[PDB]
């Protein structure tokens, strides 16, 4: 319906916005005399009885409605607006990262095939924000995915204004790391800024958002010339066993030219030089997902 329950005593009113739009007719209910109705914190009484009918046309009609009996509050009803213009719902709370594709508001990442992943999103708003995250694998017959609470994770200054980063951790309830995914994971995020309601969705396979941790224990062992034996290990967070979930690596010798070597072993022999570094990063060997961050160690 055009009005529906989001949470207990919280209701979303879908508003088709255009000049002189009629809005929606909302009927309320109080969970028998003196039953006056107020809006926010004004004593101006707007109705009596268990039911109250109001025409919601703008944000001024949204807010917290309260049925009052004899100076005693009995129930509350919060009305949020989901604004729709020319067919598109508003997306003003979250910033469009616009990569990898346009209209990308949520970006997610996984370090292994365990079914655990993290999703991030950005906003220029600093207060009065409420986020709620839900997830599932499949849409028809949804499989269980459990998400934690969305929290403020970072705060950067981009231009004059400040960017606020929020993150959430989710885990597929019954994950199968080795199976070939056929149904994508869906992530759904409700966003509330004061009286404005919006929501955002992201759909992906775990294999497509893989980004391994950097190679660990990167060491150098000179030989006698400029040759040096480079060695490293799989990261601790990567899926096991490694004979199944194999990684491939890129070894780089760079000074502040670029000599790059691609290998499947955890070791290599390169040539060092003055004020140059040896860097190694990892990637799923059999599926071209994201490269890991560089793990680096200086020569000599």
């Amino acid at each position: 319906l055009e009005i529906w329950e989001l949470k207990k005593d919280v209701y979303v009113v879908e508003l088709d916005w255009y000049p002189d739009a009629p809005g929606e007719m909302v009927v309320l209910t109080c969970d028998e005399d003196g039953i006056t109705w107020t809006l926010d914190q004004s004593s101006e009484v707007l109705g009596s009885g268990k039911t109250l009918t109001i025409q919601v046309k703008e944000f001024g009609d949204a807010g917290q409605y309260t049925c009052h009996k004899g100076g005693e509050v009995l129930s509350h009803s919060l009305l949020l607006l989901h604004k729709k213009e020319d067919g598109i719902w508003s997306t003003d709370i979250l910033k469009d990262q616009k990569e990898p594709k346009n209209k990308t508001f949520l970006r997610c990442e996984a370090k292994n095939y365990s079914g655990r992943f993290t999703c991030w999103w950005l906003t220029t708003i600093s207060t009065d924000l409420t986020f709620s995250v839900k997830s599932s694998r499949g849409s028809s017959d949804p499989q269980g995915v459990t998400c934690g609470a969305a929290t403020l994770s970072a705060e950067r200054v981009r231009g004059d204004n400040k960017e606020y980063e929020y993150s959430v951790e989710c885990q597929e309830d019954s994950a199968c790391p080795a199976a070939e995914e056929s149904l994508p994971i869906e992530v759904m995020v409700d966003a509330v800024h004061k009286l404005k309601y919006e929501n955002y969705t992201s759909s992906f396979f775990i294999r497509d958002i893989i980004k391994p941790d950097p190679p660990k224990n990167l060491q150098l062992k000179p030989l006698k010339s400029r040759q040096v034996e480079v060695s490293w290990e799989y990261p601790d967070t990567w899926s096991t066993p490694h004979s199944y979930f194999s990684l491939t690596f890129c070894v780089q010798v760079q000074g502040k030219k670029k000599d790059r070597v691609f290998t499947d072993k955890t070791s290599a022999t390169v040539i060092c030089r003055k004020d140059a570094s040896i860097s190694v990063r990892a990637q799923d060997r059999y599926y071209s997902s994201s490269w890991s961050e560089w793990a680096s160690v200086p020569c000599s």
């Binding site: 790391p177 080795a178 199976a179 070939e180 004979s243 199944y244």
Partner: protein, 138 residues
């Protein structure tokens, strides 16, 4: 029973060719198919039969109208060797005495959808044969 190191080499070449080509009723390596490490130890025939079923599935699509007709594939397209490598690997998995073999122009979208689904399938198959060659091999 299967040449593990030969299957590892062919399945690794499949992953390379599948990504060189593309830089519902579909068979998938599901969870209960035994292609996980523990499932390959108990019995690998279940996994290898599912892999063979997927290989012949994608082999038929690559040789079908979806890829044979126009827009004509570039003369040096990796799809040609990709179809041959699919047949080469599925042939290695068929044991003796067993017979496992059983409109708009804007369908270029379906080509990329098939190859994207193929990249996911051969990735799991490559992990199976690499794990089997490392553990279930003399």
């Amino acid at each position: 029973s299967p040449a593990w190191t030969q299957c590892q080499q062919l399945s690794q070449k499949l992953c390379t060719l599948a990504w060189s080509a593309h830089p519902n009723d579909v068979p998938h390596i599901q969870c209960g198919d035994g292609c996980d490490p523990q499932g390959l130890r108990d019995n690998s025939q279940f996994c290898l039969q599912r892999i063979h079923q997927g290989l012949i599935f994608y082999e038929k699509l690559l040789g079908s109208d979806i890829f044979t007709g126009e827009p004509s594939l570039l003369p040096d397209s990796p799809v040609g060797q990709l179809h041959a490598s699919l047949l080469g690997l599925s042939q290695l998995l068929q044991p003796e005495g067993h017979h496992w073999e059983t409109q708009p122009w804007q369908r270029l979208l379906l080509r990329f959808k098939i190859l994207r689904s193929l990249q996911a399938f051969v990735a799991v198959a490559a992990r199976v044969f690499a794990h089997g060659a490392a553990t279930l091999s003399p």
